[PDB]
């Protein structure tokens, strides 16, 4: 059926296979984050019995990779680059310079000070 | 609050109450709409007032008021408590009013 296990809309603007993978994880984890938090609280509350806790720790290990944010890497929304990615503009060491110098980024120019 | 109750409130308020300013300040950031947060603070203050104005369980007068938080806060504060010495203040040295 859909390439990704669960059908997902496509990220507006620049689209990349690595971006699609990251975007897929973002969409899935966003919804699963609540469950991720629920079950982890379960496993970590000593105030409980070991078994209920274990059952949970285990399910987590079983939860699919997309159910994680550690797996989501900051990637330039415009150039699909995951290296030197400033998060203030969600860009990169180049698209920034480019956008900032060109003036695409308002109030962002050169540190002449 | 009256003496006993006044002290108990401060003991109950703890860090929220700043003894240096003698002001009890608290904030609410737990509900979607701020209106719910405003009601939360109203209830919290009413609760504190009720407990403080009733030392049946404990007066808390024996408890020394905690000011450690304000002590650390005062360390952060940077003010000048030193002023030009009054004996050094010499009006005769200062020139008198000069008419035009």
């Amino acid at each position: 059926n859909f390439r990704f296990p669960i059908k997902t809309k496509l990220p507006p603007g620049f689209i990349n296979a690595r971006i699609l993978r990251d975007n897929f994880k973002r969409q899935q984890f966003k919804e699963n984050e609540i469950l991720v938090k629920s079950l982890k609280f379960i496993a970590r509350n000593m105030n409980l019995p070991t078994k209920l806790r274990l059952e949970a720790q285990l399910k987590l290990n079983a939860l699919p990779n997309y159910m994680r944010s550690t797996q989501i890497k900051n990637r330039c929304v415009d150039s699909g680059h995951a290296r030197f990615v400033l998060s203030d503009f969600r860009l990169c060491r180049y698209q920034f310079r480019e956008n900032a110098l060109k003036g695409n980024l308002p109030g962002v120019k050169k540190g002449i000070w | 609050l009256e003496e006993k109750s006044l002290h108990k409130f401060r003991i109950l308020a703890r860090s929220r109450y700043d003894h240096t300013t003698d002001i009890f300040k608290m904030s609410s950031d737990k509900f979607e709409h701020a209106s719910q947060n405003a009601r939360y603070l109203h209830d919290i203050l009413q609760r504190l007032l009720a407990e403080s104005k009733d030392l049946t369980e404990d007066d808390f007068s024996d408890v020394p008021l905690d000011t450690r938080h304000t002590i650390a806060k005062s360390l952060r504060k940077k003010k000048r408590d030193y002023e030009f010495p009054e004996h050094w203040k010499r009006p005769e040295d200062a020139p008198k009013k000069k008419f035009d």
Binding site: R44, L54, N61 | -
Partner: protein, 80 residues
């Protein structure tokens, strides 16, 4: 998950059925405290390309499946 609490690592495993015949269960996961509960069987461990067959020992306890399954091969020499 290395701590007195949160001990230790539960990696879902066919140990149950394995505990019957003992079939070396291809536990490709290779990432779990050797379970101190069943502690005893035989399985192969994916060393990147091949799963090395090993069983359970009186040393293999906290030791994680991977610690027994070497990946990179040994170094060699210069040019001649």
């Amino acid at each position: 998950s290395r701590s007195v609490w949160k001990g230790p690592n539960i990696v879902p495993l066919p140990i149950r059925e394995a505990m019957t015949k003992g079939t070396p269960i291809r536990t490709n996961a290779r990432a779990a405290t050797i379970l101190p509960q069943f502690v005893g069987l035989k399985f192969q461990i994916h060393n990147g390309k091949e799963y090395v067959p090993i069983e359970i020992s009186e040393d293999m306890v906290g030791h994680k499946l991977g610690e027994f399954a070497p990946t990179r091969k040994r170094f060699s020499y210069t040019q001649t």
